[PDB]
């Protein structure tokens, strides 16, 4: 578990964070390993770690989505540790965020959700909020449950449940960026 | 002393395959390794995280360094369908 200062991402994929090569070595991390991140307010996230030559050893590059889940801003401090124990997901339940689905077009699952997970390796954590690109907009979803819990990797075999009513965004679920 | 590539490979059950390779040696070596461990070319894909690539669909005749597999990378196996 070492701490690093938060920096902007060069890679918007929500599933990824970046480190310097030397940092990685210090941490015995390999490119592509899944990591456990800890931020503010007991918040956590699971990500894929990448190497990045432009990254200062003392910082981590982290997308807005991740930053939000961790309740951190640029220049804040997070903890990182290896998490090879993460299992493939059996089942997950997600729900759209009310304020991000006003007059959507097309089928929620097929247009917005499915292509997030389709042909993608996605480590998820219970309570996660994630952003998708489908349909010229920016739908958000919350992970309301996982099996296993709280962490898992969304696999091709993972049953993805999305049915139900759009949720109200909680106070500490507002975007900080 | 020669450039070496460390690889780690997640199995579909969560175990890890570890092995060091010569950065210079052909990709085929990798394919053979995974086969050797019970995951034959025709049944399992070897995948990278980001960018997402089907390693087993890359040129076998190409070196590891050539396919940006250097110096350390974690990959994962997935059943073919």
> Is residue A30 within 8 angstroms of chain B, CB to CB?
yes
Chain A residues with beta carbon closer than 8 angstroms to that of B81: 156
Q: Which residue of B has its CA nearest to A155?
A: B78
Are A5 and A79 contacting, i.e. CB atoms less than 8 angstroms apart?
A: no
User: Distance (Å, rounded) from C-alpha A14 to C-alpha A102?
Assistant: 23
The structural domains of chain A, with segments of one domain joined by +, span 1-85, 86-177
> Is residue A31 within 8 angstroms of chain B, CB to CB?
yes
> Is residue A132 within 8 angstroms of chain B, CB to CB?
no
How distant is the Cα of B50 from the closest Cα of chain A, in angstroms? 7
Spell out the domains of chain B, with CATH numbers in brackets: 1-81 (3.10.20.90)
Residue A114 CB neighbour total at 10 angstroms:
15
Per DSSP (E only), the strands in chain A are: 2-7, 16-19, 34-38, 44-51, 59-62, 77-82, 91-96, 122-125, 129-131, 140-147, 151-154, 159-161
Taking the alpha carbons of B17, B19, B21, B23 in that order, is the dihedral positive or negative?
positive
Answer whether B8 sits within 8 Å of A50, measured CB to CB: no
- Token code pair at residue A43: 């918040």
Distances in Å between the alpha carbon of B2 and those of A89, B25, B71?
40, 11, 12
Question: Nearest Cα to A32, choosing from B50, B53, B41, B7?
Answer: B50
Question: Nearest Cα to A59, choosing from A93, A22, A88, A11?
Answer: A22
Q: Torsions phi, psi of A72, nearest 5?
A: -125, 155
Helices vs strands, H then E, count in chain B:
1, 4
Q: Architecture of A1-85 per CATH?
A: Beta Barrel (2.40)
Taking the alpha carbons of A122, A128, A129, A135 in that order, is the dihedral positive or negative?
positive
Question: Nearest Cα to A78, choosing from A2, A9, A172?
Answer: A2
Q: Torsions phi, psi of A18, nearest 5?
A: -125, 145
Chain A residues with beta carbon closer than 8 angstroms to that of B14: 87-88
A161 strand-pairing partners: A93
* Three-state DSSP class for residue B10: strand
Are B29 and B1 contacting, i.e. CB atoms less than 8 angstroms apart?
A: no
Choices 3.30.460.20, 3.10.520.10, 3.10.330.10, 2.30.40.10: CATH for A86-177? 3.10.330.10
Taking the alpha carbons of A55, A60, A62, A68 in that order, is the dihedral positive or negative?
negative
Answer whether B50 sits within 8 Å of A33, measured CB to CB: no
Most A CBs within 10 Å: which of B11, B16, B48, B50, as the mutation test of the A interface? B50
User: Distance (Å, rounded) from C-alpha A9 to C-alpha A12?
Assistant: 6
Q: Which residue of A has its CA nearest to B6?
A: A30
Q: What is the dihedral of CA A31, A34, A35, A36, to 10 degrees?
A: 170
User: Distance (Å, rounded) from C-alpha A32 to C-alpha A47?
Assistant: 9
């Amino acid at each position: 578990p070492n701490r690093l200062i938060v920096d902007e991402a060069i890679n918007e994929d929500n599933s990824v964070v970046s480190l310097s090569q030397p940092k990685m070595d210090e941490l015995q991390l390999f490119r592509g390993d899944t990591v456990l991140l800890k931020g503010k307010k007991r918040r956590e996230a699971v990500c894929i770690v990448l190497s990045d030559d432009t990254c200062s050893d003392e910082k981590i590059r982290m997308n807005r989505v991740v930053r939000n889940n961790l309740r951190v801003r640029l220049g804040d401090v997070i903890s990182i540790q290896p998490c090879p124990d993460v299992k493939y997901g059996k089942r997950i339940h997600v729900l759209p965020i009310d304020d991000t689905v006003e007059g959507i077009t097309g089928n929620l699952f097929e247009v917005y959700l499915k292509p997030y997970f389709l042909e993608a390796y996605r480590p998820i954590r219970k309570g996660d909020i994630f952003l998708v690109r489908g349909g010229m907009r920016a739908v958000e979803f919350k992970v309301v449950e996982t099996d296993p819990s709280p962490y898992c990797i969304v696999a091709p075999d993972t049953v993805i449940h999305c049915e139900g009513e759009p949720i109200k965004r909680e106070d500490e679920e507002e975007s900080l960026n | 002393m020669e450039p070496v590539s460390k690889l780690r490979i997640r199995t579909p059950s969560g175990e890890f395959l570890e092995r060091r390779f010569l950065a210079s040696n052909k990709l085929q070596i990798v394919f053979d390794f995974v086969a050797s461990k019970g995951f034959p070319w025709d049944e399992y894909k070897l995948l990278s995280t980001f960018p997402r690539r089907d390693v087993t669909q890359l040129d076998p005749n190409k070196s590891l360094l050539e396919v940006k597999l250097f110096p350390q990378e974690t990959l994962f196996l997935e059943a073919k369908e």
